[PDB]
Amino acid sequence: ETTDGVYRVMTRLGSTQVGVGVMQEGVFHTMWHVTKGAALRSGEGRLDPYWGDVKQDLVSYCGPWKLDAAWDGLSEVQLLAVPPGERAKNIQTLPGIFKTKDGDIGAVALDYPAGTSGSPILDKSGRVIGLYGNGVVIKNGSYVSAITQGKR
Amino acid sequence: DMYIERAGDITWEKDAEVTGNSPRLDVALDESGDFSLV
């Protein structure tokens, strides 16, 4: 399967969801720590890695990174959370800011199991502005993931 | 051997639940692609 949309990344103790990915223009985008660059199966069925980067924690299959949109810095976004064993749910939120020395990157303060990481973050036009699942655990114990976007 | 399966389309929802705050955090990213809180 290669039609556009969001996909669960599974593995067989039982069938376990290790992460989430997004398919667009024939390319499967997800996070590196999800698949560790290993090949995926889509039916019968083989997706091979094309581009990856551990620092960005991103990886593309069957082609280069296609998602180009980014957060405008003012409007609210929506996390299309696809938790393990749960139907996809759109969660609207206003992202925070991750202050680094290469600049600022948006971050959403939403908590979901580790199997949900790789789920896309959308703008008001349905464009993927980044993926969810790479972040920090703050002083209270909650999880805050950055809006990690690649380069097209 | 990992495998993928469809979970839905990529579409914005008009009446979605709005939760979560907007924290401002100083963060440092190591070479291994992991963020830390500085």
**What DSSP assignment string belongs to A80-140?**
EE--TTS--EEEEE--EEEEETTEEEEEE-----GGGTTEEEE-TTS-EEEEEEEEEE-TT
What's the CATH number of domain A68-152, 3.30.230.80, 3.50.50.60, 3.40.30.10, 2.40.10.10? 2.40.10.10
The ranges of chain A annotated as CATH 2.40.10.120 are: 1-67
3-class DSSP state of A71:
coil
DSSP annotation of B34: -
Residue A66: CA atoms inside 13 Å, Cβ hemisphere, count?
15
Inspect the interface and report whether the beta carbons of A10 and B17 lie closer than 8 Å: no
- Which phi and psi angles does A6 have, rounded to 5°? -105, 140
Inspect the interface and report whether the beta carbons of B20 and A56 lie closer than 8 Å: no
Structure's resolution in angstroms: 1.9
Residue A129: CA atoms inside 13 Å, Cβ hemisphere, count?
23
Q: How far is A70 from chain B (nearest CA, A)?
A: 15
- Of the candidates B9, B21, B27, the beta carbon closest to that of A109 is on B21
CB-based contact, A118 to chain B, within 8 Å: no
Q: Does an H or E element contain A28, and which?
A: strand A27-30
Domain range for B10 is 1-38
At A8, the amino acid letter reads R
How many CB atoms are closer than 10 A to CB A28?
25
The CATH code belonging to domain A1-67 is 2.40.10.120
Residue A149 to residue A69: CA distance in whole angstroms: 8
Interacting residues of A60 by C-beta distance below 8 A, sequence separation 6+: A27, A28, A29, A49, A50, A51, A52, A66, A150
Phi-psi region of A133 (alpha: psi -120 to 50; beta: other; left: phi over 0): left
- Chain B residues inside the 8 Å CB shell of A40: 2-4
Domain count, chain B: 1
- The β-bridge relationship of strands B2-8 and A40-41 is parallel
3-class DSSP state of A21:
strand
